[PDB]
Amino acid sequence: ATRFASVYAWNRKRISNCVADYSVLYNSASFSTFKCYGVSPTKLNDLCFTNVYADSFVIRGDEVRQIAPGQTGKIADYNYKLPDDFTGCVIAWNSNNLDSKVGGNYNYLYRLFRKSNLKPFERDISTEIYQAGSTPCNGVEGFNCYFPLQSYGFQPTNGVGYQPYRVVVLSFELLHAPATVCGPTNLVKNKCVNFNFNGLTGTGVLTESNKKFLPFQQFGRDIADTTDAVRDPQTLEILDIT
Amino acid sequence: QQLVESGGGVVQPGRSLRLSCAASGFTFSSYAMHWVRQAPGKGLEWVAVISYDGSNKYYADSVKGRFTISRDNSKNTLYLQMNSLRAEDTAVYYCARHATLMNNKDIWGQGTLVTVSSAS
Amino acid sequence: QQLVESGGGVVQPGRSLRLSCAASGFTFSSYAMHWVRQAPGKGLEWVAVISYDGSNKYYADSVKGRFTISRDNSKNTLYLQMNSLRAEDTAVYYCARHATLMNNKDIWGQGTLVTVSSAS
Amino acid sequence: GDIQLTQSPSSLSASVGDRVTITCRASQSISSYLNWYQQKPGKAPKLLIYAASSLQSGVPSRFSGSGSGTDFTLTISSLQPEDFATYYCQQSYSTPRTFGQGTKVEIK
Amino acid sequence: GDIQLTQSPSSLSASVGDRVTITCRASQSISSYLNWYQQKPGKAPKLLIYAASSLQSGVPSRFSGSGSGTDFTLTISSLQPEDFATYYCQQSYSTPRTFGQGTKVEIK
Amino acid sequence: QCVNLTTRTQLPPAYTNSFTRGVYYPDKVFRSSVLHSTQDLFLPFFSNVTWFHAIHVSGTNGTKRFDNPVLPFNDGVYFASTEKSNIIRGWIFGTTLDSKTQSLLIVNNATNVVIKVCEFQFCNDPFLGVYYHKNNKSWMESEFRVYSSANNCTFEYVSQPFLMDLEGKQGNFKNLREFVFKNIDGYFKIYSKHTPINLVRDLPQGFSALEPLVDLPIGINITRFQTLLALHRSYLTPSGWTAGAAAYYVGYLQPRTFLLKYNENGTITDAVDCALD
Ligand SMILES: *[C@@H]1O[C@H](CO)[C@@H](O[C@@H]2O[C@H](CO)[C@@H](O)[C@H](O)[C@H]2NC(C)=O)[C@H](O)[C@H]1NC(C)=O
């Protein structure tokens, strides 16, 4: 994506009803800090999800260690809060060649203060004045009270610790809802083969067959409630099972 | 990034003249905004605030003429109607912002002349 | 628990000097073991491994001098002979172990000086 | 009542390479809430220092702020031929905000 | 080729009670295989963090590791008068192993 | 929006008798000329089917009667309509018919059906408004005459239009169109059919087999619903609304054991309900 917002107004995209391309995630390998939870990253290729939340933002190259489920520091204190029990992956890389511009990048922002720690996964776009001392400023700025937000200072004159990371966070769950988002061998003809089609499993001799399905159908069956004939998913064809 | 102002002109005293000032580059919406006055040869005198992030309006009691201030946030614009005029207010006005130890957002309009006189 | 080293000293270049390092508390046998180098004012530079649990020997190609490494497992001791010397290797060596996400066994010897020079 | 400012001196005709200390004094104890502006007469007031002790983008350290409480200081150093203009201090402590009367640094 | 390490900064003269972030950057994407060491000059390198995210016996949470991939972080917090020494990061990803050049935290 | 037209129509629901009706294929498995028996939710034969008219002219002059109630889902739902001129688009299926629950909004949109499972705010008299965009002689559809808010949405989908015309036939088809809606096990599945009918209104003796259209990971209980409508605006004649006419058929499903006589080509003609007589 071409434009991530800051952490005071981070973008969130509910994703479901599609398939996961988890391969090139690992094959990318241009990513600085790439960690996961729940169960191992090699294991998550197939172990799949009811409803994922893909939310992304841009933070500094020093504060990204604050992004960890159950830590402190400003981004996890007042800006964006990972929960106490978390599943997803934190994906983090540098975008110094895009974000930090000569003449100064000050598009990006963050919240520096709030009168409590932040509830998990809840943004804070309320840019009203907080009153640290007791003297009421009441919407306008003043004494004992500060402005809530502040920018970052990004230029390519920054060191490597001050480079902008485009942290995208993937968060997962499991419900009574089915695995709506879920990740992914040459067929044998006229030869005894073990097989699986679409999860249907058995062992037989697969042949070409002229029995004619209705389109929506999957299996055929015989009188005996055996699985007699199946249709090849990738290339629709009517395959007997003997 | 940029601030534009409504047109100044010569107005008879006691009248009213709405002041429009539209923003560009970044919104009015997340910030406050101010008005200040510069008479020729005189210092910059603050006039009035606006505070959109709640809603509150503060006026200078030095020039307490009920110069009313409110918004058009969706156009990033701000309206202060010149009420209860008197000739020493004949000056140039600016749309303003104060760096309150946190931001660096002090952006100033181009400046337009309000004139309070019976002679055009 | 504890690692002891063979004696360091001043050796002329091109020569050889076997390095002995004996363990105590727990055996060498079930683990690997390493050697590292510290020149004065220089960082810790890894030298070579030993892997008793099969048998394999890896050397740094940065200092690739056929500094040979093998065992005396029954004495919990390890031998790396200083071969093909050159003066910039004049440093202190350590017997080492790396916590490879599983163990916490990083135990370090006391450190002895190898010196490579024709002047004693 | 209001908070009075005291900008001193209200003008100082200066020369090349000077180090001018334009003082803005305060009637109350203000923490650091004071600013500084560049105005050639007819321009927009270009902010110079924020919170009385911090520089600004585009403006090098030839300007330099310090002070707190009542006493605030504009530390102009190595005075440049473009720096000769009408300048201003600024409270943001309470409401109303007042600005100083201005100090015109000008060529001798 | 070899795997390059990048330890930054290579020194930082510090004060009491600080929170120093000694960064060890990597040329490749290393899973978590990075460590940290205490060395007063002449001592044995006392291991501080293993697998870049786990504390060690005898060493309280004034030290705190995090990071993965290329980016690794030494999170020293509430900096103690005994913690001023020469420190090191460490790969164990491939063969050869390299160590960082060291970061000497020292009294200001 | 939420423009509301209530009217004053209260009447005994005109009933009917589904003779052989509402037999879908409850599997993908292809079977040929066999008698298969399952006990599943169906509309049992010879059942009370509540003919319901969304818009009803009873002639004096005009007098268009907008009656279509919010209706409970109960166990399962059957649907049938003719509508040579389509005035029907989709259904509001839900529970609260409001926020606080999800919402099933299967709106064809009269291009490609956009199936929406979201959280909406459905008005008191929801239906799809249609007007003239004035550009390229086009008729848009104002979709917020149904519902005010659209947000929080859980699911979205698009497909080829379930509702389809043929026409040119000056009747003699009526294009009888049936849709079965069954909500189970996280899959709310849709069924369809298109049939010619020469009879004036009610249903023939023929069998109608309904294939599953899409099996969707839904996960909500739907206890109540109402249909949707397409109306328009007129201009000065002695706001414009009440287009043409509208009537449809509704019946509720029920677990029953049926006998599926699949034909050699895999298609069921004769079905028999065991708990009939
Ligand atoms: C189906 O949705 C309805 C909401 O309309 C739920 O029905 C309610 O169930 C509670 C029991 O927890 C009863 O006390 C209420 O009287 C019911 N409401 C109505 C209008 O009948 C029902 O729980 C939902 N079913 C499932 C499986 O979630």
Author numbering:
A (entry chain B): 344 to 527, 531 to 588
B (entry chain G), C (entry chain H): 2 to 121
D (entry chain J), E (entry chain L): 0 to 107
F (entry chain C): 14 to 251, 256 to 294
Please share excerpts from the published article on this structure.
To define the P17 epitope precisely, we characterized the complex between the P17 Fab fragments and a prefusion stabilized SARS-CoV-2 S ectodomain trimer using single-particle cryo-EM. Cryo-EM characterization of the complex revealed full occupancy for the antibody where one Fab is bound to each RBD of the homotrimeric S. Similar to previous studies, 3D classification revealed that the complex adopts two distinct conformational states, corresponding to one RBD open + two RBDs closed (state 1) and two RBDs open + one RBD closed (state 2). We obtained asymmetric reconstructions at 3.6 and 3.8 Å resolution of the SARS-CoV-2–P17 complex in states 1 and 2, respectively. Unlike the epitope of H014 that is accessible only when the RBDs are “open”, the P17 epitope is accessible in both the open and closed RBD states, which is in line with the stoichiometric binding of Fab to the S trimer. Expectedly, stochastic RBD rotations with different angles as a result of the switch between the “closed” and “open” states were observed in the complex structures. Interestingly, in addition to targeting the RBM, the P17 bound to the “closed” RBD contacts the neighboring RBD (residues 374–376 making up an upstream loop of β2) through the fourth solvent-exposed loop, the DE loop (named as L4 loop as well, adjacent to CDRL1 and CDRL2 that joins the D and E strands on the antibody), from the light chain. Given the specific interaction mode involving forming contacts of two neighboring RBDs, P17 is capable of, to some extent, linking two adjacent S monomers, which probably restrains the conformational changes required for the progression of the life cycle of the virus from the prefusion to the postfusion stage. Structural analysis revealed that the “closed” RBD conformation, corresponding to an ACE2-inaccessible state, is still capable of binding P17, indicative of a full occlusion of SARS-CoV-2 S trimer.
During the establishment of SARS-CoV-2 infection, the Spike (S) protein binds to its cellular receptor, angiotensin I converting enzyme 2 (ACE2) via the receptor binding domain (RBD). Like other coronaviruses, the S consists of two subdomains: the N-terminal S1 domain, which possesses the N-terminal domain (NTD) and the C-terminal domain, also named as RBD, and the S2 domain, which is responsible for viral membrane fusion. Similar to other enveloped viruses (e.g., HIV), the S undergoes dramatic conformational changes from a prefusion to a postfusion state enabling fusion of viral and target cell membranes. In contrast to this, P17 binds to the RBM tightly and is therefore capable of blocking the binding of SARS CoV-2 to ACE2 completely by making the binding site unavailable.
